[PDB]
C-alpha cells in the first residue's frame with residue numbers, strides 16, 4: 001500500500017535544524033550547527049528532505065505539526081537547487097503548503113494561494129500520486145478533509161519528501177515536526 005516509513009536525510013539538512021537520533025523528528029535550533037557544506041545541503045532556509053526517492057506510484061505519510069506557528073510540507077524534485085535563495089513554488093519544482101505567522105496558511109502555487117482552514121491541523125497527511133500528477137494535503141484533525149491538491153504536475157525523475165519546521169525568528173517556534181507512526 002501507499003503508506004511509507006519516511007526518514008530524514010541528514011545530508012540535506014540546513015545547519016539551523018536539529019534532527020532526532022532516529023531521524024523521524026526535526027526542529028529549529030537556536031544557533032547553527034558546524035557541519036559540511038556538501039552539495040545536497042539546503043544552505044539558505046531551515047529545510048530538509050526525506051531519504052526516500054519516488055520514481056512512480058502512490059505514497060502517503062503523515063506529519064504532526066501541533067502548536068507550531070510555522071512549518072512547510074510537501075514534495076519536491078530531487079533536482080531542485082540546494083544553494084541560495086529561491087521561490088517555494090510549483091513552477092520551481094516544489095509542491096508544498098505551509099503555515100506562518102500562526103494563522104496564515106498558503107499553498108505554494110505561483111502566485112501563492114491563500115488557504116482558509118476551519119480547523120487548524122495538528123496532523124497533515126501528504127498523498128503523492130506520481131502517475132496522476134497529483135500531490136494532495138489532508139487535514140487529519142478535520143476527518144481527512146482536503147487542504148489543497150496540486151494537479152497536472154507532470155513529474156520526471158525522482159521526487160523527495162520535503163520538510164521545514166519553520167524559518168529563523170529569534171529562537172521562537174522550537175517544537176518539532178514529527179513523522180507519525182503509520
Ligand SMILES: CC(=O)c1ccc2c(c1)N(CCCN(C)C)c1ccccc1S2
Nearest residue numbers: 070071072086087088098100164166167
Ligand atoms: C514563498 C517562498 O518562496 C518561501 C520561501 C521560503 C520560506 C517561506 C516562503 N516561508 C513562508 C514565508 C516566511 N517569510 C515571510 C519569513 C516559510 C514557511 C514555513 C516554513 C519555512 C518557510 S521559509
